[PDB]
Amino acid sequence: DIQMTQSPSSLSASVGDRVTITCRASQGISSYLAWYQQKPGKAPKLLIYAASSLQSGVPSRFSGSGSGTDFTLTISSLQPEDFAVYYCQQHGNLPYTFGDGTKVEIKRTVAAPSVFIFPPSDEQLKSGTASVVCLLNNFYPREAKVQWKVDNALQSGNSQESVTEQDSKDSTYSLSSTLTLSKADYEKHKVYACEVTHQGLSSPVTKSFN
Amino acid sequence: VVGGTDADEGEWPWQVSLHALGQGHICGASLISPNWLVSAAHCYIDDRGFRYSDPTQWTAFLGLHDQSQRSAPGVQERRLKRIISHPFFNDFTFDYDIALLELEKPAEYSSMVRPISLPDASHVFPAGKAIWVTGWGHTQYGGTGALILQKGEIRVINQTTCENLLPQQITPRMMCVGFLSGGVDSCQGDSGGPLSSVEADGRIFQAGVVSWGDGCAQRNKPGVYTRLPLFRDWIKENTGV
Amino acid sequence: QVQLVQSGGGLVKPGGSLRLSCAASGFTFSSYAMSWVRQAPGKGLEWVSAISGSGGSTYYADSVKGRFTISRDNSKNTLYLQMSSLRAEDTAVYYCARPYLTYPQRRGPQNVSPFDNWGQGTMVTVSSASTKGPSVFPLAPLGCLVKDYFPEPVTVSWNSGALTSGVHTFPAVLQSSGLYSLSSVVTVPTYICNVNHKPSNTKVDKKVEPK
């Protein structure tokens, strides 16, 4: 059973850069090596077969080389829509075996998050829970840290973040932190504050409701 | 056959053309007895809504030289009554690619219809030996099937090289015959026909059966044929030949 | 054009069974071996099984041998996979996939190919826990918010595909109830968010507006 090994596990590169990914087979596989591109929610897409043959309709900046145990995928000039997980597969022996995947993210000029805050609908407050929803819209880089403060009061272990996949046209993210408290705990505090620290932000913007 | 030439009339009297209903020539076969033909198993797998595995859907033409002259003196037309594919035929790998075809009515020997001799289990066709593939298959990859029967001189290749040129695809039942410079090769619709070994003495044995290839006539990709000797006892047993 | 349209999937209790389907069109199905390939959540691709064009020969990966069965009906142009004795680790998206043939105009064996066309995938969730519809909840102003459902997936739209731009539907987060939760905001300077959760046959179109 052939083991395929990919390097690096993930990477970040700028539009126009040259990107190089490596695949390693535990035994020789002649030229029977393929490269797939998987975009979020989508099926894998065949880029390269037999190590160096480019599937028709696949852009010319994608290219492969290698033999035996040692293979490389090159993107000569990275484009935003090239955001994806890239997989090598051996196509010689059964079981056909895939590499573990190389995540390619795009590295972009800094962009500040559009912070919003949402207070729980009455409907949801009427059946006993409060969900406060704070939105960070279309920012880069992915790193943020947003903090919850009730009556100017840290929260810890009552919020959850959820980041969208990188956008295929302009390489930004969106994030959502959500605070969940009982209508009992919600009903007995007055200041609800979201405070985002981002690179694209000079000093934490905090957007709140009373 | 790619890169071959027109056979001479009556030069391959054991070569048979298998016609499927509505399709003209589809596969080759080899006359081994008045009642029996040797062809490739993969020719009789149901495909595209057509029941290729069904004897009644086939006609065999013997003593045929030219597909546009099937009423020529000498041509004998025969319906099939049975198809016996090797029980280990695997259509995923093409391993054990051989089948036996029973005629409804016996062939009649003539200048144009004559049988070819089967090899003993022990028979060996060594590397470098010049042998012959014949057929009405395409004369180029993705091309058109020959009207006149075609012949190609090809040479045995050793099994180590064979396995190397076609990694993970060559089994002990298979042999590569051809050239590393490609050029001369079996192609589509030659399948099931004879690989014919013509000896300097006048004897003629059937080395193998046209099986598959990676394209046709490509460099480093010679045609692959089923090795006949391995099947001697299986042929005797099921046919009595 | 070549298409592979899949159906099936869902939630099944462990040890239970399911049949996945792949309906093929646009090429000669019967001439093509086929495979099923799977992908665990957040994980890689794993080849699962293959079948020759005739149905004659079948292969399975070890983790699945004996529990699964791949089959085909060339008259319906459809590929099947029967999964049984289902464990937790079988939870995944299952794709069907067609081999890439280098020289398709001569017949030959198909054992050395990567995959050129794939179905859209079918999510299969193996778990004891029972199906449960979602609770939509518009956000002020904008919303909305799809809470407490199980299992995945829940799909979301806006004004029946009116809002295509501006919209971010977030990846669901597991609440430490057990049940999942997501928000789907579109952006923003009188709308309805079409929630659809096929496992529980729930369907909502809760409207968003500040009254």
XYZ file of C-alpha atoms in Angstrom:
662
model
C 0.000 0.000 0.000
C 1.678 3.089 -1.326
C 1.964 6.100 1.006
C 1.790 9.541 -0.622
C 3.320 12.440 1.226
C 2.836 16.102 0.463
C 4.817 19.197 1.302
C 4.038 21.702 2.569
C 0.820 21.004 4.461
C -0.252 24.574 3.662
C 1.155 27.723 2.245
C 0.417 31.397 1.524
C 1.521 33.133 -1.617
C 0.919 36.364 -3.449
C -0.869 36.881 -6.727
C 1.689 36.472 -9.509
C 4.037 34.357 -7.396
C 5.439 31.028 -8.453
C 4.092 28.230 -6.284
C 5.696 24.804 -5.953
C 4.232 21.785 -4.161
C 5.974 18.451 -3.591
C 4.592 14.892 -3.540
C 6.408 11.774 -2.373
C 5.545 8.120 -2.937
C 6.853 5.433 -0.612
C 7.765 3.195 -3.570
C 8.244 4.035 -7.180
C 5.182 4.651 -9.315
C 6.717 5.340 -12.603
C 4.863 8.283 -14.012
C 1.442 7.393 -12.704
C 0.954 10.479 -10.651
C -1.959 12.913 -10.835
C -2.707 16.353 -9.345
C -6.218 17.459 -8.410
C -7.682 20.827 -7.361
C -10.426 20.887 -4.782
C -12.385 24.006 -4.112
C -14.634 24.264 -1.068
C -17.879 22.283 -1.458
C -16.811 21.096 -4.902
C -15.548 17.808 -6.290
C -11.863 17.370 -7.055
C -10.822 18.621 -10.499
C -8.201 16.800 -12.567
C -5.309 19.131 -13.388
C -2.387 16.927 -14.387
C -2.168 13.203 -15.246
C 0.779 10.879 -15.806
C 3.007 13.318 -13.879
C 3.428 15.974 -16.563
C 0.395 15.841 -18.848
C -1.993 18.788 -18.577
C -5.731 18.008 -18.776
C -7.358 19.866 -21.638
C -9.107 23.086 -20.677
C -6.798 23.465 -17.685
C -4.847 26.771 -17.726
C -1.231 26.733 -18.967
C 0.242 27.995 -15.683
C -0.370 24.613 -14.103
C 2.422 22.109 -14.710
C 3.944 18.949 -13.308
C 7.227 17.095 -13.464
C 8.765 14.075 -11.786
C 9.351 10.327 -11.873
C 9.382 7.365 -9.609
C 8.988 8.669 -6.087
C 9.411 12.351 -6.391
C 6.941 14.790 -7.950
C 6.282 18.535 -8.170
C 3.263 20.670 -9.126
C 4.102 24.207 -10.217
C 1.802 27.194 -10.538
C 3.825 29.666 -12.439
C 1.795 32.733 -11.527
C -0.801 32.413 -8.790
C -4.271 33.828 -9.287
C -6.948 34.476 -6.678
C -9.251 31.764 -8.050
C -6.404 29.313 -7.453
C -7.298 29.139 -3.809
C -7.842 25.496 -3.083
C -6.554 22.256 -1.657
C -4.228 20.532 -4.075
C -4.014 16.741 -4.008
C -1.573 14.302 -5.562
C -2.835 10.778 -6.309
C -1.019 7.686 -7.376
C -2.735 6.071 -10.296
C -0.838 2.836 -10.662
C -1.814 0.274 -8.084
C -4.914 -0.474 -6.190
C -5.866 1.031 -3.729
C -5.295 4.278 -5.465
C -3.921 6.564 -2.759
C -4.072 10.364 -2.447
C -1.608 12.653 -0.736
C -2.910 14.381 2.390
C -3.296 17.705 0.606
C -1.621 21.078 0.264
C -3.817 24.074 1.141
C -2.956 27.062 -1.003
C -4.216 30.396 0.388
C -3.666 33.748 -1.283
C -1.672 36.474 0.309
C -3.068 39.826 -0.128
C -2.895 43.418 0.807
C -4.310 44.218 4.232
C -7.972 44.854 4.488
C -9.971 46.005 7.497
C -13.053 44.015 8.705
C -16.551 45.547 8.462
C -17.776 44.949 12.023
C -21.497 44.502 12.706
C -23.407 43.471 15.801
C -26.770 41.743 16.041
C -28.975 41.474 19.148
C -31.201 38.386 19.685
C -34.636 38.418 18.082
C -37.454 38.657 20.594
C -38.746 35.352 19.226
C -35.578 33.589 20.388
C -35.516 35.596 23.625
C -38.976 34.121 24.024
C -38.148 30.655 24.368
C -35.371 31.153 26.731
C -32.024 31.822 25.058
C -30.052 34.812 23.854
C -27.738 34.682 20.834
C -25.586 37.760 20.210
C -24.039 37.688 16.726
C -21.006 39.800 15.813
C -19.921 39.896 12.143
C -16.488 40.642 10.651
C -16.952 41.261 6.924
C -14.414 40.870 4.090
C -11.066 41.250 5.813
C -7.476 40.067 5.360
C -5.494 38.524 6.935
C -7.463 35.803 8.663
C -6.080 36.465 12.091
C -8.397 38.346 14.273
C -9.317 38.328 17.887
C -12.789 39.575 18.862
C -13.726 39.774 22.483
C -17.106 39.829 24.217
C -17.810 42.180 27.120
C -21.024 42.136 29.163
C -21.442 45.238 31.309
C -17.772 45.805 30.449
C -17.128 42.233 31.452
C -14.961 39.617 29.710
C -16.574 36.587 28.434
C -14.791 33.274 28.382
C -16.093 29.977 27.030
C -19.491 31.245 25.899
C -18.698 32.428 22.364
C -17.883 30.610 19.081
C -16.152 31.814 15.932
C -16.940 30.698 12.386
C -14.780 31.849 9.457
C -15.778 31.612 5.809
C -13.459 30.007 3.298
C -11.225 32.465 1.448
C -13.060 34.309 -1.335
C -12.090 33.216 -4.836
C -12.252 36.734 -6.370
C -10.697 38.975 -3.769
C -9.142 36.723 -1.241
C -10.861 38.071 1.847
C -12.493 36.300 4.817
C -15.685 36.780 6.860
C -15.976 35.863 10.539
C -18.793 35.419 13.049
C -18.447 35.182 16.837
C -21.646 34.230 18.660
C -22.348 34.613 22.370
C -25.014 32.348 23.830
C -26.511 32.988 27.261
C -29.760 32.018 28.934
C -32.546 34.599 28.893
C -31.913 34.658 32.650
C -28.285 35.732 32.308
C -29.059 38.004 29.374
C -31.924 39.736 31.155
C -29.644 40.817 34.000
C -26.940 42.776 32.156
C -27.215 45.967 30.055
C -24.034 46.511 28.012
C -23.290 44.043 25.225
C -20.038 44.844 23.434
C -18.054 43.368 20.526
C -14.459 44.550 20.194
C -12.373 43.534 17.200
C -8.611 43.788 17.025
C -7.364 43.501 13.451
C -4.112 44.315 11.680
C -6.034 46.510 9.348
C -7.415 48.242 12.402
C -5.248 50.835 14.168
C -6.941 50.266 17.530
C -9.888 48.004 18.482
C -13.213 49.182 17.102
C -15.958 48.127 19.452
C -19.572 48.044 18.298
C -22.277 47.426 20.908
C -25.957 47.619 21.843
C -27.694 48.296 25.160
C -2.921 -2.717 -38.256
C -0.824 0.466 -38.309
C 2.161 0.684 -40.654
C 1.488 -2.678 -42.276
C 0.737 -3.504 -45.914
C -1.923 -5.285 -47.970
C -1.866 -9.031 -47.439
C -1.670 -11.048 -50.627
C -4.749 -12.968 -51.559
C -5.084 -16.196 -49.568
C -1.915 -15.557 -47.576
C -3.699 -15.794 -44.194
C -6.438 -18.454 -44.732
C -7.010 -18.877 -40.972
C -7.868 -15.167 -40.447
C -11.539 -14.564 -39.679
C -13.707 -11.447 -39.602
C -16.384 -11.153 -37.003
C -19.310 -8.879 -37.950
C -21.809 -7.661 -35.464
C -25.344 -6.909 -36.488
C -25.558 -3.514 -38.060
C -21.915 -2.681 -37.567
C -19.838 -4.422 -40.172
C -16.455 -5.778 -39.037
C -15.850 -5.524 -35.262
C -13.318 -8.223 -34.196
C -10.908 -10.796 -35.556
C -10.695 -14.522 -34.975
C -8.579 -17.527 -35.898
C -9.716 -20.742 -37.542
C -8.381 -23.660 -35.515
C -10.787 -26.492 -36.517
C -13.709 -26.968 -38.809
C -15.996 -26.014 -35.927
C -13.947 -23.650 -33.742
C -12.454 -20.137 -33.806
C -10.081 -18.547 -31.308
C -10.807 -14.891 -30.519
C -10.463 -12.368 -27.659
C -12.852 -12.521 -24.718
C -13.173 -8.737 -24.455
C -14.868 -8.742 -27.886
C -17.978 -10.421 -26.457
C -18.820 -8.184 -23.526
C -22.201 -6.455 -23.732
C -21.562 -2.816 -24.563
C -23.641 0.189 -25.693
C -27.011 -1.595 -25.427
C -25.755 -4.185 -27.904
C -25.474 -7.762 -26.631
C -22.014 -8.696 -27.901
C -22.029 -11.739 -25.589
C -24.814 -13.215 -27.703
C -23.815 -15.644 -30.478
C -26.897 -14.843 -32.553
C -25.752 -11.245 -33.015
C -22.581 -12.318 -34.816
C -21.650 -13.465 -38.297
C -18.250 -14.894 -39.122
C -16.686 -14.538 -42.564
C -13.956 -16.975 -43.640
C -11.768 -16.826 -46.737
C -12.370 -13.099 -46.724
C -9.791 -10.759 -48.260
C -11.708 -7.533 -48.873
C -14.568 -6.209 -46.757
C -16.291 -4.714 -49.814
C -16.306 -8.114 -51.581
C -17.934 -10.491 -49.124
C -19.668 -12.401 -51.938
C -16.345 -13.295 -53.567
C -15.647 -16.885 -54.557
C -14.060 -18.476 -51.537
C -15.780 -16.470 -48.837
C -17.718 -18.631 -46.409
C -20.250 -17.159 -44.098
C -20.980 -18.849 -40.821
C -23.257 -18.131 -37.923
C -22.081 -18.814 -34.391
C -23.715 -21.201 -32.084
C -21.658 -20.611 -29.008
C -19.161 -18.276 -27.319
C -16.903 -19.505 -24.507
C -14.907 -16.772 -22.785
C -12.201 -17.747 -20.391
C -13.585 -18.009 -16.900
C -10.782 -15.865 -15.529
C -11.193 -13.084 -18.076
C -11.136 -9.806 -16.153
C -12.457 -6.888 -18.138
C -10.814 -4.417 -15.742
C -7.241 -5.698 -16.312
C -7.849 -7.649 -19.540
C -6.023 -10.622 -17.939
C -6.829 -14.015 -19.481
C -8.154 -12.328 -22.636
C -9.187 -15.285 -24.822
C -12.413 -16.848 -26.115
C -13.556 -19.818 -28.242
C -16.251 -19.547 -30.865
C -18.275 -22.492 -32.110
C -19.476 -22.409 -35.690
C -23.044 -23.364 -36.489
C -21.917 -25.140 -39.590
C -18.414 -26.306 -40.413
C -15.905 -24.422 -42.389
C -14.771 -26.092 -45.568
C -11.061 -26.072 -46.369
C -9.976 -24.462 -49.558
C -7.372 -22.177 -50.873
C -8.909 -19.436 -48.753
C -10.083 -21.293 -45.731
C -7.417 -23.318 -43.880
C -6.680 -23.842 -40.167
C -3.615 -22.686 -38.196
C -1.751 -24.969 -35.762
C -1.979 -24.503 -31.999
C 1.213 -24.343 -29.868
C 1.916 -26.906 -27.132
C 1.984 -25.554 -23.568
C 5.759 -25.773 -23.763
C 6.113 -23.791 -26.952
C 8.289 -20.692 -26.711
C 8.572 -17.669 -28.971
C 11.793 -15.982 -27.847
C 12.594 -12.257 -27.673
C 13.516 -10.732 -31.009
C 11.504 -13.191 -33.068
C 9.814 -11.608 -36.063
C 6.142 -12.460 -36.172
C 2.925 -11.288 -37.748
C -0.281 -9.584 -36.830
C -3.090 -9.397 -39.373
C -6.409 -7.600 -39.332
C -9.001 -5.236 -40.726
C -8.647 -2.855 -37.788
C -7.865 0.860 -38.011
C -4.819 1.838 -40.061
C -4.082 4.733 -37.650
C -5.134 5.612 -34.109
C -8.716 6.910 -34.240
C -8.708 6.139 -37.952
C -10.542 3.922 -40.410
C -10.593 0.107 -40.695
C -8.852 -1.357 -43.739
C -10.982 -2.754 -46.565
C -8.155 -5.070 -47.707
C -6.712 -7.344 -45.001
C -3.506 -5.861 -43.494
C -0.273 -7.523 -42.297
C 2.373 -6.181 -39.907
C 5.813 -7.622 -39.190
C 6.471 -7.213 -35.475
C 9.068 -8.578 -33.019
C 8.719 -10.224 -29.620
C 9.865 -8.075 -26.709
C 11.102 -9.503 -23.431
C 8.780 -9.624 -20.464
C 10.966 -7.434 -18.240
C 10.968 -4.669 -20.842
C 7.275 -5.294 -21.444
C 6.395 -4.814 -17.758
C 8.606 -1.713 -17.722
C 6.911 -0.051 -20.735
C 3.479 -0.816 -19.309
C 3.940 -0.758 -15.489
C 1.318 -2.492 -13.340
C -0.543 -3.678 -16.472
C 1.383 -6.736 -17.745
C 0.525 -10.207 -16.421
C 2.151 -13.566 -17.192
C -0.630 -14.207 -19.749
C 0.544 -11.250 -21.819
C 3.250 -10.512 -24.306
C 4.450 -7.413 -25.980
C 5.075 -7.660 -29.657
C 6.139 -4.746 -31.729
C 8.932 -2.217 -31.709
C 10.153 0.396 -29.248
C 10.185 2.929 -32.043
C 6.473 2.179 -32.460
C 5.331 2.658 -36.032
C 4.051 -0.851 -36.682
C 1.338 -2.082 -34.355
C -2.064 -3.645 -33.873
C -4.976 -1.254 -33.476
C -8.721 -1.017 -32.968
C -10.636 -3.804 -34.580
C -7.656 -6.150 -34.878
C -8.599 -7.554 -31.520
C -9.210 -11.257 -31.245
C -7.260 -11.948 -34.456
C -4.145 -14.166 -34.914
C -0.617 -13.415 -33.944
C 0.950 -15.710 -36.517
C 4.420 -17.244 -36.227
C 5.693 -18.278 -39.611
C 8.701 -20.588 -39.406
C 11.533 -20.811 -41.917
C 10.435 -24.412 -42.435
C 6.885 -23.729 -43.596
C 5.121 -24.523 -40.365
C 2.733 -21.944 -38.973
C 1.757 -21.645 -35.324
C -0.497 -19.169 -33.579
C 1.710 -17.399 -31.050
C -1.052 -15.286 -29.534
C -4.306 -13.306 -29.780
C -4.633 -9.564 -30.380
C -5.563 -8.162 -26.978
C -4.916 -4.474 -26.205
C -2.475 -1.599 -26.440
C -1.844 1.895 -25.089
C -2.992 3.646 -28.255
C -1.524 2.283 -31.519
C 1.972 2.401 -32.996
C 3.276 4.797 -30.306
C 6.918 4.884 -29.265
C 7.540 2.629 -26.256
C 3.981 1.306 -26.381
C 3.819 -1.926 -28.432
C 0.663 -3.994 -28.661
C -0.105 -6.604 -26.016
C -1.235 -10.092 -27.003
C -2.617 -13.062 -25.092
C 0.004 -15.881 -24.950
C -1.586 -18.930 -26.592
C 0.569 -21.754 -25.197
C -0.789 -21.246 -21.739
C -4.201 -22.048 -23.014
C -3.622 -25.417 -24.809
C -5.285 -27.611 -22.284
C -8.088 -25.198 -21.778
C -8.719 -25.297 -25.495
C -8.518 -29.099 -25.732
C -10.799 -29.436 -22.740
C -13.588 -27.119 -23.920
C -13.347 -27.749 -27.675
C -11.718 -31.114 -28.291
C -9.207 -29.581 -30.673
C -21.662 17.077 -21.915
C -20.499 14.362 -19.543
C -22.519 14.271 -16.344
C -22.640 12.246 -13.163
C -25.730 13.049 -11.083
C -25.767 11.394 -7.675
C -28.621 10.695 -5.256
C -29.032 9.061 -1.888
C -27.271 9.664 1.330
C -28.585 10.918 4.588
C -28.461 9.867 8.228
C -28.218 6.146 9.104
C -27.887 4.539 12.541
C -24.679 2.548 13.052
C -24.883 -1.032 11.745
C -27.634 0.076 9.369
C -27.449 0.195 5.568
C -27.810 2.545 2.592
C -27.646 2.543 -1.193
C -25.982 5.416 -3.031
C -26.794 6.143 -6.672
C -24.967 7.807 -9.549
C -26.890 8.427 -12.775
C -24.572 8.960 -15.727
C -25.250 10.759 -18.989
C -23.417 12.117 -22.012
C -21.084 9.202 -22.717
C -21.220 5.459 -23.167
C -21.563 4.346 -19.524
C -21.067 0.654 -20.178
C -17.627 1.255 -21.698
C -16.288 2.782 -18.475
C -15.113 1.233 -15.244
C -16.225 3.409 -12.346
C -15.135 4.218 -8.811
C -16.594 5.539 -5.581
C -14.261 7.866 -3.658
C -14.913 9.400 -0.222
C -13.855 12.298 1.909
C -14.307 12.515 5.685
C -15.177 15.964 7.117
C -12.157 18.267 7.144
C -10.059 15.284 5.780
C -8.567 13.929 2.631
C -9.716 11.733 -0.241
C -9.980 7.967 0.090
C -10.645 5.591 -2.780
C -13.378 3.149 -1.797
C -14.187 0.738 -4.625
C -14.134 0.201 -8.383
C -16.085 -1.775 -10.968
C -15.296 -2.679 -14.573
C -17.635 -1.564 -17.353
C -19.382 -4.899 -17.393
C -19.910 -5.403 -13.723
C -17.738 -8.437 -14.012
C -14.862 -7.327 -11.801
C -14.957 -5.408 -8.517
C -12.398 -4.039 -6.067
C -12.579 -2.608 -2.540
C -10.236 -0.835 -0.140
C -9.520 -2.837 3.004
C -11.346 -0.529 5.451
C -14.499 -1.362 3.501
C -14.130 -4.851 2.057
C -17.053 -7.101 2.941
C -19.259 -4.298 4.289
C -19.837 -2.482 0.991
C -21.008 -3.582 -2.436
C -20.437 -1.796 -5.729
C -22.730 -2.630 -8.629
C -24.122 -1.189 -11.829
C -27.022 -1.236 -14.239
C -25.837 -0.394 -17.704
C -29.398 -0.221 -19.039
C -30.190 2.630 -16.625
C -26.733 4.193 -16.997
C -26.478 4.166 -13.185
C -23.753 3.226 -10.659
C -24.626 1.931 -7.166
C -22.914 1.459 -3.830
C -24.470 -0.539 -1.032
C -23.070 0.308 2.397
C -23.768 -1.950 5.366
C -22.515 -2.527 8.902
C -21.990 1.209 8.896
C -19.593 2.563 11.499
C -18.851 6.106 12.628
C -15.736 6.328 10.464
C -17.821 5.812 7.282
C -19.293 9.308 7.729
C -18.225 11.246 4.715
C -19.114 12.631 1.360
C -19.202 10.027 -1.352
C -18.406 10.939 -4.945
C -18.687 8.751 -7.984
C -15.899 9.233 -10.503
C -15.025 8.331 -14.098
C -11.491 7.208 -15.097
C -9.438 9.373 -17.409
C -8.563 7.392 -20.549
C -5.484 8.490 -22.465
C -6.381 6.735 -25.680
C -10.126 6.111 -25.607
C -10.447 5.151 -29.268
C -8.865 1.865 -28.640
C -10.315 -0.473 -26.132
C -7.979 -1.693 -23.368
C -7.868 -2.208 -19.605
C -8.686 0.768 -17.368
C -6.631 -0.038 -14.276
C -4.066 2.754 -14.447
C -6.186 5.908 -14.572
C -6.802 8.946 -12.379
C -10.345 10.397 -12.482
C -11.559 12.944 -15.035
C -15.243 13.455 -14.101
C -16.868 13.332 -10.652
C -20.463 13.416 -9.428
C -21.450 16.264 -7.102
C -21.091 14.153 -3.958
C -23.530 12.690 -1.476
C -23.234 13.321 2.272
C -23.637 10.255 4.481
C -23.934 10.744 8.252
C -23.737 7.683 10.506
C -25.037 8.362 14.003
C -27.409 7.160 16.705
C -28.849 10.637 17.364
C -32.156 11.473 15.677
C -32.941 13.972 12.906
C -34.056 17.451 14.001
C -35.266 20.473 12.027
C -33.765 23.985 12.341
C -35.070 27.142 14.036
C -34.747 30.176 11.759
C -34.242 33.548 13.498
C -33.833 36.785 11.508
C -31.015 39.100 12.608
C -31.436 42.824 13.256
C -31.496 44.485 10.837
C -28.727 41.689 8.386
C -30.093 38.256 9.257
C -30.828 35.584 9.442
C -29.761 32.631 11.578
C -30.349 28.882 11.310
C -30.118 27.189 14.697
C -30.390 23.723 16.261
C -30.650 21.160 13.460
C -29.253 17.696 12.786
C -27.626 16.325 10.806
C -25.834 18.356 8.159
C -26.282 19.656 5.627
C -28.548 22.690 5.683
C -28.691 24.775 2.515
C -29.608 28.468 2.364
C -30.774 30.905 -0.315
C -32.152 34.420 -0.583
C -35.331 35.500 -2.341
C -35.056 32.216 -4.308
C -31.628 33.065 -5.705
C -32.305 36.786 -6.064
C -29.432 37.811 -3.826
C -26.444 36.067 -5.392
C -23.932 38.779 -4.552
C -23.101 40.122 -1.099
C -24.121 36.888 0.626
C -21.985 34.970 3.140
C -23.413 31.680 4.422
C -21.154 30.624 7.312
C -19.777 27.115 7.984
C -21.943 25.470 10.653
C -20.553 25.247 14.171
C -21.263 22.371 16.512
C -22.981 23.653 19.590
C -22.223 21.760 22.767
C -25.762 20.596 22.831
C -25.043 18.264 19.982
C -26.777 20.201 17.287
C -25.420 22.428 14.610
C -25.877 26.133 13.942
C -25.094 28.668 11.222
C -25.891 32.211 10.148
C -26.218 33.384 6.541
C -25.920 37.154 6.163
C -26.268 39.096 2.931
C -24.998 42.650 2.634
C -27.006 45.173 2.910
C -26.911 48.821 1.834
C -37.401 43.389 2.512
C -35.825 39.939 2.247
C -36.476 36.234 2.916
C -33.901 33.502 3.610
C -34.895 30.131 2.142
C -33.749 27.475 4.618
C -33.945 23.828 3.535
C -33.008 20.826 5.628
C -33.721 17.695 3.735
C -33.036 15.174 6.434
C -35.913 16.423 8.599
C -37.937 17.603 5.594
C -38.032 21.058 7.205
C -38.474 24.112 4.969
C -38.693 27.748 6.055
C -38.584 31.220 4.446
C -38.509 33.479 7.530
C -38.553 37.175 6.602
C -36.037 39.788 7.767
C -37.085 43.348 8.705
C -36.832 45.730 11.720
C -40.342 46.506 12.998
